[PDB]
Design a protein around this ligand. Structure first.
Ligand code: FRV
Length: 282
């Protein structure tokens, strides 16, 4: 660590504080994450160093010293949460929302083809730069090992599924997609049950018809209230039919019916996708 000069505190991640730092030797500016160490984690993280893609924040180095673990990542200048807050008055232009969604699906397609999942996607770990790129951060750290938001958590996780799949990332991204469009969180729950019931109230309480096996899930209760499903035209208004169609497929209850990243990239919504440059005030 003596090899790094902490510049400022970026934030408090899931495992440790994240600092903007400068490599005292290479003069390189990076994002340093101190993890709060099993050999299992070491190997798992080591694999992530090889998982490189344009839409994945590059894991530059893994420093394991004094029984402590530090992860050194590529540095970007702003996260999606801050960008959304800054675009709250006018909203992010649709062409830019489409580009971001398209790029993120590429990132997921890549990670998922390598059997790596994120598990905790959210505006805070989606990073953007001046060139119009957006990247996913903290990928794979879940498998390795303030109150965390439940807003983007997939229903199978909330119902107790222990062996969830890559589909949990598509769910989260669908929630983020809707939020960029409407400028309001889709499912802002403040407890697991509130999160679950907010999902039910919008998409309808799931049953054996739309989700085979759902009633036999660990945390499923026959006593769950039964709410009817709402039209997407009401859920995400400004979004065109193609967008609403894709979103619906990203939010299917049954993980096995939920669209994959690869298939989503082929959806009609991306027929006119372009790469606009955002207006970033750094
Ligand atoms: C305070 N919000 S912000 O918009 O001012 C902002 C500016 C610059 C940022 N740079 C980053 N680069 C790479 C990685 C991260 C990052 C952010 N969080 C986490 C948990 N990470 C983790 C370390 C992998 N951040 C970020 C956030």
């Amino acid at each position: 660590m003596e090899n790094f000069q902490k510049v400022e505190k970026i934030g408090e991640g899931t495992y440790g504080v994240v600092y903007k730092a400068r490599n005292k030797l290479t003069g390189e500016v990076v994002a340093l994450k101190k993890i709060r160490v099993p050999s299992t984690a070491i190997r798992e993280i080591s694999l992530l160093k090889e998982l490189n893609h344009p839409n994945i924040v590059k894991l530059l180095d893994v420093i394991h010293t004094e029984n402590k673990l530090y992860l050194v990542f590529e540095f970007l200048h702003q996260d999606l949460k801050k960008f959304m807050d800054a675009s709250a008055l006018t909203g992010i232009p649709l062409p830019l929302i489409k580009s971001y969604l398209f790029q993120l699906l590429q990132g997921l397609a890549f990670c998922h083809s390598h059997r790596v999942l994120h598990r905790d996607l959210k505006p805070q770990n989606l990073l953007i730069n001046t060139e119009g790129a957006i990247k996913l951060a903290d990928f794979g750290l879940a498998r390795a090992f303030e109150v965390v938001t439940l807003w983007y958590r997939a229903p199978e996780i909330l119902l107790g599924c222990k062996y969830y799949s890559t589909a949990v990332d598509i769910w989260s991204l669908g929630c983020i997609f809707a939020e960029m469009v409407t400028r309001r969180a889709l499912f802002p729950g403040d407890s697991e049950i509130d999160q679950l019931f907010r999902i039910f109230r919008t998409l309808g309480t799931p049953d054996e018809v739309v989700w085979p096996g759902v009633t036999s899930m660990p945390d499923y209760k026959p006593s769950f209230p039964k709410w009817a499903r709402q039209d997407f035209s009401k859920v995400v208004p400004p979004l065109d039919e193609d967008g609403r169609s894709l979103l619906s497929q990203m939010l299917h209850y049954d993980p096995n019916k939920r669209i994959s990243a690869k298939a989503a990239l082929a959806h009609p919504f991306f027929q006119d996708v372009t790469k606009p440059v955002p207006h970033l005030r750094l």
